[PDB]
Design a protein around this nucleic acid. Sequence first.
DNA 1: ATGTGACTTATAGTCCGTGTGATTATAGTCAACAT
DNA 2: ATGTTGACTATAATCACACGGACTATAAGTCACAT
Lengths: 76, 77, 77, 76
Amino acid sequence: ESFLLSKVSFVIKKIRLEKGMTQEDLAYKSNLDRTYISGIERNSRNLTIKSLELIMKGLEVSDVVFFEMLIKEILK
Amino acid sequence: ESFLLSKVSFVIKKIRLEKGMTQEDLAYKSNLDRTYISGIERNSRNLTIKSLELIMKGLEVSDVVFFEMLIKEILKH
Amino acid sequence: ESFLLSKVSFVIKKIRLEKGMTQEDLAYKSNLDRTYISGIERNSRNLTIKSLELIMKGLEVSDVVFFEMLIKEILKH
Amino acid sequence: ESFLLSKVSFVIKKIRLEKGMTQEDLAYKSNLDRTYISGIERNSRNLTIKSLELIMKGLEVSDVVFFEMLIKEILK
DNA sequence: ATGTGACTTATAGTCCGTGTGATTATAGTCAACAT
DNA sequence: ATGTTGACTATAATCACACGGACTATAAGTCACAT
């Protein structure tokens, strides 16, 4: 697998938790499948930008805040 | 179509020109098709994080500084 | 246009496919642009003997062999 | 220079002679410039196929006869 | 007759990119059953 | 609640090709002057 893809997934999970969201709720809020979300967080999916974008909207987080976080997570 | 995509595709081109690369060098170095690099810049196209990573390696740029330029482009008026 | 050209054009393609090459491979080994190889096959362009020679070397074929197939294609019905 | 180019030129000169033509006359007959022809025969020109075709018309020699000859010439 | 040289102008050949049908690999989406 | 296994189907990604515009190298065509 990929380093970036792992950090992306980790970040998605991180933000979901600091917001006290469940996966079920993250999937409802972004209209995607819960098993889809699950899959990403267990790093079994290689998402596209479009999908990533839907997940950010579901997390209620701006692109910028996401990447700010993704950068920080990337640096150990 | 997608907000972030045209930002990603814009930044891939920006860097590519900054580094005085041509499309088909980058297509080689990124270990993706000739026409895919074109298609990404040309229209936008919906790439995969793995493909984006390949391109970053190809732009000879780090994940970090890519995303830093990504943020800057998003923030523009 | 020109009689001999489209024949030369035809034979370059024929050989190229007989050898399972692609235009990309060919323009590769002929050290010409892939645009030019396309241009030749497409619209029978007016190449120079030197360029033809490069293409022969690219097709991994000899002067002789080429011209022998050239003669054949000219003679056909 | 090129090997092929020299033998094309040699052939052009060979045929012009076997026929008894001057350069002046090969130029007239093919509607090309005499210095143009002189250049080719000293092999100071890299013809295009089109030009070669005009010289064949001037020599009154079919493509086939020209190439049959060029081949033979090519093999020392 | 032929052979130079040198000087325009057409075009051969280069270089970077666009746009496209067809095929292959794979993400997108949604089942059934788990815990 | 979340995890996992197959699935089906959309589409990401590949591969071979056509096509254009702009630029550079050089062949095409014509002088003058040799011999």
